[PDB]
Each structure stands twice: as C-alpha cells, then as structure tokens.
Design a protein around this ligand. Sequence first.
Ligand SMILES: [Ca+2]
Ligand SMILES: [Ca+2]
Ligand SMILES: [Ca+2]
Ligand SMILES: [Ca+2]
Ligand SMILES: [Ca+2]
Ligand SMILES: [Ca+2]
Ligand SMILES: [Ca+2]
Ligand SMILES: [Ca+2]
Ligand SMILES: [Ca+2]
Ligand SMILES: [Ca+2]
Ligand SMILES: [Ca+2]
Ligand SMILES: [Ca+2]
Ligand SMILES: [Ca+2]
Ligand SMILES: [Ca+2]
Ligand SMILES: [Ca+2]
Ligand SMILES: [Ca+2]
Ligand SMILES: [Ca+2]
Ligand SMILES: [Ca+2]
Ligand SMILES: [Ca+2]
Ligand SMILES: [Ca+2]
Lengths: 353, 353, 353, 353
Amino acid sequence: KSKTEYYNAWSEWERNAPPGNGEQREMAVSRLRDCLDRQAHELELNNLGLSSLPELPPHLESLVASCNSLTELPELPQSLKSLLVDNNNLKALSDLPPLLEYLGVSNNQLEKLPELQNSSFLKIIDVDNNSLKKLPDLPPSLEFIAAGNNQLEELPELQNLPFLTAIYADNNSLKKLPDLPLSLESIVAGNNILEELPELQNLPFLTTIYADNNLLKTLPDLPPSLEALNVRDNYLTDLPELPQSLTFLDVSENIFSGLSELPPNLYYLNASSNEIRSLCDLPPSLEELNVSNNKLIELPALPPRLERLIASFNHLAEVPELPQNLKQLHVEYNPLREFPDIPESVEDLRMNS
Amino acid sequence: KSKTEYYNAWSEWERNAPPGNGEQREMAVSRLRDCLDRQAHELELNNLGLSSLPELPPHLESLVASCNSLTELPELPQSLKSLLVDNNNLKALSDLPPLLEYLGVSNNQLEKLPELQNSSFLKIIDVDNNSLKKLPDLPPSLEFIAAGNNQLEELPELQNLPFLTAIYADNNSLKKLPDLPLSLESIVAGNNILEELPELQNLPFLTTIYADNNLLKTLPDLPPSLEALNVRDNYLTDLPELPQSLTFLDVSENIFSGLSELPPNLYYLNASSNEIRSLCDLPPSLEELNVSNNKLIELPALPPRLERLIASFNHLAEVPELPQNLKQLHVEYNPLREFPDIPESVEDLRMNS
Amino acid sequence: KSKTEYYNAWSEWERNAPPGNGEQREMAVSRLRDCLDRQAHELELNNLGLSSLPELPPHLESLVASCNSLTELPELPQSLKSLLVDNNNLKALSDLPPLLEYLGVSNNQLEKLPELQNSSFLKIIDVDNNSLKKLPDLPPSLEFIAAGNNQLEELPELQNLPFLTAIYADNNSLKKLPDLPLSLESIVAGNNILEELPELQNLPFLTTIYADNNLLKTLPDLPPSLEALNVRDNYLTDLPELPQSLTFLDVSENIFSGLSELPPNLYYLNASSNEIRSLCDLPPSLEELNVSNNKLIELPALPPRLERLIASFNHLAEVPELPQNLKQLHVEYNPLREFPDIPESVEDLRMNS
Amino acid sequence: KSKTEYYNAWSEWERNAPPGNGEQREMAVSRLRDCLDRQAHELELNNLGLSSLPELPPHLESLVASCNSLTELPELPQSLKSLLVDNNNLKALSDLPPLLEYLGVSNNQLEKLPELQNSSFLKIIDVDNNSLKKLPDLPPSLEFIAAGNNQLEELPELQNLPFLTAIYADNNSLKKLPDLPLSLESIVAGNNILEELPELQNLPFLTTIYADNNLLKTLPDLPPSLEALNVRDNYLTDLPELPQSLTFLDVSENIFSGLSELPPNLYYLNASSNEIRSLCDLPPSLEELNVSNNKLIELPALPPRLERLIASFNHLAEVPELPQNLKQLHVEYNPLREFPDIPESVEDLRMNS
Ligand SMILES: [Ca+2]
Ligand SMILES: [Ca+2]
Ligand SMILES: [Ca+2]
Ligand SMILES: [Ca+2]
Ligand SMILES: [Ca+2]
Ligand SMILES: [Ca+2]
Ligand SMILES: [Ca+2]
Ligand SMILES: [Ca+2]
Ligand SMILES: [Ca+2]
Ligand SMILES: [Ca+2]
Ligand SMILES: [Ca+2]
Ligand SMILES: [Ca+2]
Ligand SMILES: [Ca+2]
Ligand SMILES: [Ca+2]
Ligand SMILES: [Ca+2]
Ligand SMILES: [Ca+2]
Ligand SMILES: [Ca+2]
Ligand SMILES: [Ca+2]
Ligand SMILES: [Ca+2]
Ligand SMILES: [Ca+2]
C-alpha cells in the first residue's frame, strides 16, 4: 500500500471515530502517519481511547496501543516484534506475529491466548489481568510471563523453559505451580490457592518468591539464593532454613508464634500479623522491621541499620533503644510505659499508648 | 382478645415465619407473650429479623421493633406512646396512634409520613434515613425531630413549634431551613444544599448548629449562646462574631485564609483543610486544635490545656512548645526542621517530616 | 463551714488558677456554689481544665470532675457515693470515702489504688487507662470493674465477688485471669498476654467474653449462655462447642482454616484474617458476616437476614446471591468473575476485582 | 595506587566496619575490587549500610552509593561524571568533580551545596530531601534539578538556564519561583508558600506544573502547551484559560464553586474537595474524574472514555449513566436514590448512600 492508501485508510478510520467517545484518532492517525513516514519501528498509540486500530504501518516492529478500548487488533505485521496493547478490551488475539518478542496484553479481556509455544522469539508474555482460564504451552524462548490476575487453575509446564526467569501468576486459582525452570529468578504467585510450592531448592537462580495469600502450610526447601520471599498470609508456623541471600522476607499474616532465626543479610522483615511472641535477634543488616500486630511484649535489640520499625499493635511496654538512622518508627498501639528516645533521624513517627 | 387468642395469633404468626429467613419469631412470640402476660407497657422485638409483627399486645404503650425487616406495622394500640421501629423496611406508616410521644422510624423506606401535626403528644420524631421527600407539618408538641438522610427539599414550618429543641435534617436537599423555633437548642442540617442558614441570632437556646457540607458562603449572626458550630465544608471565608459560649467549632474545609479570632472558651477547633496561613492566638481553653491541611508555617503558642494538636499537612518548620497535658500530637507532613519535645502526656503521636 | 467560707475558699482557688492554663475555675466556682447552695448531691466540673479542686461542698455525694488536670483530689466527703474524675492526672487516690459506690478514675496516672476491699458500697470501679501494676483486692460489693489499659500482670481474686458482673481488664499484661465469679456477665480482657482463659463453662451469666489479642491457642468450654465472644487475634484453630446463645462471634485473626459450625442464632461473625478456606452454612440469623481476608474461593449461601457481608480479600470467583436486606457488601479484592446482583437494599457497597 | 593498595585500603576499611552496624563492607569491598579490576565506570554500593566509603577506584565515572549511612564522601575522582549517594547522612559535599553530570544526593542532610554553577557538565542535580536553605547558582548545563523537600526560601535564578527542563522544588518555603527558563518542561513546586507562580505563558515547553499546596489565589496565564497542572490545595476560584494540551488537571482542594470549562483533551480531572456545585460538560477524553467531596447534586453526562469516576462525598441523587469502559466508580457518600447500573467494566466500585 502507498502512504496515501494508509493515510486515507487512517483518515477513514479517524472519521469513523465513534462520536463523543473521546477517541483520539486524529492523534492516532498523526502517530500512524509519522510512523509510516518515518518508517519507524514503533507505533505508539497509548491512551488514545481507540476502540479500534486501522491497518498498521506495514513494517511496524512494535505496536504500543496501551490504554485504549481495543476489542480487536488490526492484522499484525509479520515484522511485529513487540505488541503492547495492555489496558484494552481485547477478548482474543489472532495467532501471534512470527517475530513477536514481547506480548503485552495485560489488562484486557483475553479469554484465551493464541498458541504461544511456536513463538520462536516470544521472550515476554504479559497477559496479566485478563480472563485466561488457561495459558497455552509456553515457547522455549519465554523469559518472562506475567499471567497474574487471570483465572488460571493451572500454569503450563514451565520446567522446560530454558530462559524463563520471571513468572507472575499471582491472583489466579493455581492450586499448584508446575515444577519451576532452572532459569527462574522470580516467581510471583501470590493470591492463588497454592496448597504448596513446587520444589524450590534446585532453583539456584530463583531469588524472588511471592507466594503470599495462598494455602501454604509449609515452604519447600528454599531456592539457595533466594533474596525475596513473600509468603504473606499463608499458614506458615515455620520457615525452612532461610537462604542467607534473603534480604526481603514477608511472612506477615502467617501463624508464626515467633521467629527463631532471620537471614544474616535480611534488610526487610515483615512478620506483622502473626502471633509472634518473640523475635530472635535481628540481623544488623535489617533496615525495615515490621512485626506490627503480633504478641511481642518486647522487641530484641534493634539493629543500628534499622531504618523502619513498625512494631505497632503489639504488647510492647518499651521500644528498645532506637538506632540512630531510624527513619520510621510506627509503634502505635503498644502498652508503652513511655515513648523511646526518638533519634533525630526519625522522619516518620507514630506512637500511641 | 384472650391471651390464648393472642398466643395462638402469635404462634400462627411464628409458624408463618418465612423459612430460612432467620426470623426469630419464637423469641418475638416469647416477648409478645411475656409482654401480654406481664401486661407490660413495652414490647421489645429488636433485631429479631421479623418481616412482620403479629397483632400487638392490646395495651402496648411502647413498641420497640427496631432492626427487623418490617415492611408493614401491625395496627398500633391507641395506647401506644412510643413506636421504635427504626431499621426496618417500612415504606409507610398508618396514621399515628393518638398518644404517640415517640415516633422512631429511622432507617426505613418511608416515602411519606402520616399527618403529624395532630399528634398532641408527639415529642420525638425520628424519621432519619428514610425516603421522605417531605415532612408533614409538625405537631406543636414536637420537641425533637430527626429527619436527616432523607430527600427533603424543604422542612415544614418550624418557627411555631414551641418545644422543638432539636432538629436533625442533615443529609437532605434542603436549600433553606425554615425560620427556626425560639426553643431550638440544636440543628443538624449538614449535607444539605443550604445556600444560607436562617436567622440564628434570635435563637437564645440554639447551642448546636451543624450546617457542614452545605453551600454556605456566610453564616448569619450566630445564636448568642451557640456552643457548637460545625460548618465544615462550606464556602466560609469569615465567621460572624463568635458567641463566647462556643466551645466546639468546626470550620474545616471552608476557605478561611486564617482565623482572626477564636471564642475564649473554645475547647475544640477544627479548621483543617482551609487555607489558614495563620492562626490567631488560641484560647487557653482550647483542648483540641485541628488545623490539619492548611498553610500554616507556624502555629501560635499552644494553650496549656491543649490535649489534641492536629496540625498535620501544614508548612510548619516547628511545632510550638507542646503543652504538658497534650495527649495527641498529629503534625505529620510538615517541613518540621525537628520534632518538638514530646510531653510525657502525649499518648497519640504522629509526626512525619 | 459557712457558704461564705466555701465561696471564699473557692474564689481564692479560682484566683489561684494558673494564669493562661485555660482552667475554668470561674465556672467551677459557679458549679461549686450552685452545688453548695442547692445542697446538690452532685458537683459536676467536667472539662474545666482544673489542675486542682478546692474544698468540695460538705455533703457532696457525687463528684464529677472528669476531664480536668487534677493531679490531686481535695478531701472527699464521707457522704461521697460517686467519684468520677476520669481523664485527670491523678497519680494516687486517698483512701476511698466509706460510702463510695462509683469510683470513676479512668484515664489518670494512678500508679496504685487505695484499698478497695473494705468499700462496702463500691459497686463500680473504673480505673481504666491508668498506670496500675496491681489492683487491690476487690470489695464484695464490686459489680463492675474496668481496669483495662493498665499494667496489671494479675487481677486480684475475683471468683468470690458475688456481684461482679463486668470485668474490663483488657490492655494489661495479664498472663492469666483469676477464676471468674459466678456472677460475671462480661469479661473484656483483650490485649493482655493470656495464655489461656480460666474455666468459663461454669459461668452461667457470662454472656460476653473479649479475649482478643491474647495468646490463646484454645478456648475453654464456653459460658453456656455466652452471647458475645471476641477472641480476635489469638492462635485459635478451633472453637469449643459454641453456646447457641452466641450472637456475636469475632474469631478474626486467628488461625482457623475454616469454620465447621456457627451458632444458630449468630448475628455477627467476624472471622476475617484467618485462613478460612470454607465456611460452614451460615445461620439464617446472621446479619453480619465478615470473613474478609481469608482463603475463601466460595461463600456459602448467604442467610436472607444477612445485612453486612464483608468477604473482601478472599478468593471469591463469585459472591453468592445477595439477600434482599443486605445493607453492606464489601467483597473488594476477590477474583470475582463478575459482581453479584446488588439488592436495592445495599447501601454500602465495595467491590474490586 | 596499585590494586593491592586499593584492596588493602578497602580491606582495612572493611575491617573498620563499626561492629554490629550491619555495614556490608565485605560486599562493598567486593564491589570496589570488581570495579577496580574490571576498571568499571561505575561502582554501585547501594544499601550496604556503609557509614563511609574507602578511597574509590581511581577512574570511577559513576559512584552509586545510595542508601548507606555516609556522613562523608571519600575524595571523588576527577573522572566522576555521576554521583548517586541519595539516602545517606551527608551534611556536606566537597566541591564537585569537574566532570560531574549527575549529582544525586537526595535524602541526605546537606545543609548547603558546593558551588554548582561552574559544573560545566552538571546536567542533573537531585538534592531533594536535604536541609538546604539555599541552592548555589545553577550551572548553565543544568537540565534537571530536584531540590524539593528542603528549606529553600528562594531558588537561584533559573531563567538563564538554557537546558533546565525540570525543576522539583516542592516542599520548600519558596514564596516565589524565579522566572522560569524557556526550556522548562516541568516544575514541581507544590508545598511551598508560593503566593503566585511566575509568568508561565512564555514557557512553550512547560508541560507540567505542580504548584499544589501553595498560597496561590490565581494562576498566571498558563504555559500554552501545559499538559499537567496540579494546583491542588490552593486558593483558586478560577483558572486561566486552560491549554488544550492539558490532559492532567488537579484543582482539588481549591475554592472552585464550579468548573465552567475543561480542556478538550483532559484525561484526568481531580477537582475533589472544592465547592463545585456544578461541572461543565466533561471532555470525551476524560478518563478519570475525581470531583469527590464537592457540592454536586448532579454530575454531567459521563464521557464514554471515563474509566475512573470518583464523585463520592457529593450531593448526588443519581450517578449519570456510567460509560461502558468505566473501571472505577467511587460515588460513596452521596444521597443516591439508587445505584447506577454498573457497567461490567467496573472493576473498582464503592457506593454508599
Ligand atoms: Ca485539530
Ligand atoms: Ca481483572
Ligand atoms: Ca539457621
Ligand atoms: Ca496474631
Ligand atoms: Ca492484634
Ligand atoms: Ca427452641
Ligand atoms: Ca438511606
Ligand atoms: Ca470578636
Ligand atoms: Ca487549603
Ligand atoms: Ca494541603
Ligand atoms: Ca466573666
Ligand atoms: Ca494509657
Ligand atoms: Ca456443634
Ligand atoms: Ca490468613
Ligand atoms: Ca490475604
Ligand atoms: Ca563471608
Ligand atoms: Ca526530610
Ligand atoms: Ca475556554
Ligand atoms: Ca468544599
Ligand atoms: Ca464534604
């Protein structure tokens, strides 16, 4: 097609803008034209309220039409490497362009996804916030898949994905997670109905695990290099040995009656809303301690690195001597006989006896 | 009717309890019987999930059937002095029992009220939270009427009610309030669309005025003995001379660029969310000062009686020396160069630089 | 003393009002005089910012000096039956007037209480919010004692108090509660460090138990006529058989993986923040169901009496058909495939997918 | 220096790690060594709790030592182009390295900054959240300066900064802003004490203006291509003609009695907490309308593009027909005679009558 044909196709599309629907087709056409004229790789029509897209520039490699009202996508060029149409009303996707590297279709109404396993270059799949009941098998090229906030009852096999480093499958109805790929560096699967996590100890690169809001009673042996573990709101009474690489630990809303050990390099500990009666010594690396809403009548010595202390809703008669770099002290609702001396560093303070 | 007839009428009513509707007719019948047997003045069937009431004990003087699913009321005895059926699904009321002194029908679906002006003993009318578009003229005996949260566009004439001491007509669509009765001690008419308040200065007994959330640009001369004035969220830039009897003042969410004067006996001042750049000296009587969300770069000397200081969301570099009985200090979000010394009395503290 | 001596003593006291401390001694003197002149039983000097009280009218039976800055109390008349000086700075109390029936000294700085067991008429002791480390033994006349928010590590023996019907000892450091008196109708001891509750099954009149925020792992057999049980935030996985008299149940923040049974007349159930995976059928009497923040993928049929449904933060794909009298629906943060039909009765709605 | 000297200097520094202070000098040394060995341009020692840094690798171009407890910085290489030491305890900075392009020292305790005007390559200055009372004159190379949350009473001259495109000077005590540079694309100066904004109409590139929380009574003629205007919490009753480029408008907490006009391409309008009695027609481009807490008894037709409608705390009897792509409906606290039909698109709903 000649530019004129595109221009006219686009102007026609523009004229067809549903009156009053605030569709910014003029801007879109302008983007389309510029894209066509510049022979630009990417076309960005974000937040233009487009209820549809006209034919796309012929050699578009990247279609960014996020935040529109697209219920359908125009045919995608075989040159398309990146499709970012998150926040649209897409209920379906045509088979992916052979060169698709990035599939950004989060916040849509996708009921199902087209086959993905044959997408030799599909590295990122973001189908987060859709109505996916199932995910097609994933392409070996998959490095990242966000399929959170869907209605997935199962995830396709993942262990054989050589490059899958990040999985977001939170807010689904996963009862189990498939065995994880050795390459996995991160898995966010909170708010599912995971009875248990798959084996994790053999995941040397898994550094982030979010399995909060699940039905976990125990955690498997953790990834040896786990750095962030969020299992907030589960039924954990204990934690397996914690990788010393763990710097972020959220075991809030579990049923810990205490924390016997904390990783030596933990920066963040959120153990709020457990039944923590006592905290083991805190690692000097600890910067944020949230043990809010527990049954602590006493906090252990606060690490001098502690910047955020949230120990509100506990039975503290006293807050230990505050570290001099403490930025935040939320010890609200504690039978504090007196407020602790507040370091000048404290910027955020909340205390209530 | 004999007790047996009542018992049986009641047992029949009990048996007619919609299955599964959790109606506690058995308890109700038990109450009914006890009432009948004891010849008790009052029958209390609160929160029994009753979708209806059977015939009431013959000489019931007080019917308390609050929190049920009554869509209709059984015929009320001519001996009824008190009708408390708040929180029901009453869409209408039969003409009131001649001796009705208390009409408690708040939280119902009353579309209209039966004539009230001829209720020689109607002292309290609580039709709050209903679907009243209008209130019938009020009985001279009216001492209290709560008709708030209705769809009243007007209130009936009130100035001629010799004993009306309290009017709750907040949350209605009143554009104006009728002239108020000399007897009025309190008027709560916030959340209406009052363009102005009626003359108030000639209301020697009016001690409480709630005209918050209206369309007030100014307040009339206030009741000389006004004690509580809540005109929160209006378009006030100024206040008329404040009665020295004023102990409670809420002028929050108005457009005060400052407060030049405060009643000498003010206990509570909520001037939050105005554009207060400066506060006049605070009366030593002040116990609670809420000037949160203003444009104060400085607070005046805090009265030693001050117990609650909410000056958060201001431009305070410093919080003045805190009074020794200060219980609450919320100065969160102020460019505080430093937190003020916190009196040991402070139980509730919130500071954020 | 002659009135003049009192007047002058009072005027002298008035003149001694610390300048600027907002003490309303003039009003106090006015109250004092009126009390003296009227020979009134009660003297009410509430919220007058009084840092002290002058000699009290000679035959005062009731001293109400709540909300002042009293650090000391003037000698109390032997005729004093009621002492209400809550919200003051009292650190100590002289031995109680022999006729003291009501000891209202909540919100003070009482470090200790004078002997109470010999107060033949002491019926109500409110020493809530003080700095009591211990409570003196209680008088057999004690019907009500609120000693909550203190530093009590133990409560005096209570089982022998024939008329003790209400105990508020929440917010203390009670590890155990003494055996409860047969007369006990209510015990509020939340926010203590109760490892367990004392035997309760032999308390036929105990209808209210608040043992929230403690260290309860189990509850003893409950008072047979228990009506309200709040054991919010404890370590409960199970509940003993629930008295059918139970209408209020708060087992939120415990470790329930489910609720197998609910009292047949339960009006209120707060089981939020547990690990509830399933709810047993709800009693048709249920008006408020709060199972917010659980692991419910499904709610049981909602009782038609249900007025408040808080099932937010769960894994609900669907909210069951809403009862027609539902006033509140908070099902925010649930993977709801769709919002349920909202009954016209719903006044308070919050949904978030 | 030889690597060994650096290694040893670093190991010595490491050994000097204050015991128990959680300083991760080992990791730092590891980073230092790797940096030295790799001859890397950048050294990243973020969040290592370092109370000090040892001598830096000799040809470091970028020092990233954010989130540490640095109170002092080691001598910076003349090769340093980027200094990112935000979130430290730096009270002073030595004269900047001649090649400094990025000065990231936000969240420190800088009382003053070294001369900056002679930093020929200083493009980004981030001294946000410090204790700067004044900013040295800025270098002509300055493209971005964030000096927000300081104690600036004045900003240095800016109009002559040819490349200054972004100024963050919010949360200071600026009474006035210097004339703005033609190059300015964004100015965030909310929470100052700006009596007025400088002339803006001659700023063709100024697309973002945040002057919220100031003392603005009026806005100057706006930058012709202004896209985002946040003047939340000011004393605005009117707005100058709004650039049609305006897509983001926050005039919340001002004193608008209404909005007569809205930019045709406005996506976001936050006019909450004004005294808006009526809204002009909404541009079809409007995606978010927040007129919460106003005095609206009626909302205008909702643009079909509207995704977020926050009209809570108003006097709405009815919510206009909701657009089919509405994602959020917060109309809580409105005397709604009935809830509007909720489009299936609504994911976030809050209604309260
Ligand atoms: Ca045009
Ligand atoms: Ca969704
Ligand atoms: Ca270990
Ligand atoms: Ca707990
Ligand atoms: Ca708790
Ligand atoms: Ca029975
Ligand atoms: Ca209502
Ligand atoms: Ca005056
Ligand atoms: Ca303001
Ligand atoms: Ca503000
Ligand atoms: Ca006087
Ligand atoms: Ca206390
Ligand atoms: Ca049972
Ligand atoms: Ca849970
Ligand atoms: Ca949860
Ligand atoms: Ca090591
Ligand atoms: Ca700061
Ligand atoms: Ca115009
Ligand atoms: Ca307003
Ligand atoms: Ca309002």
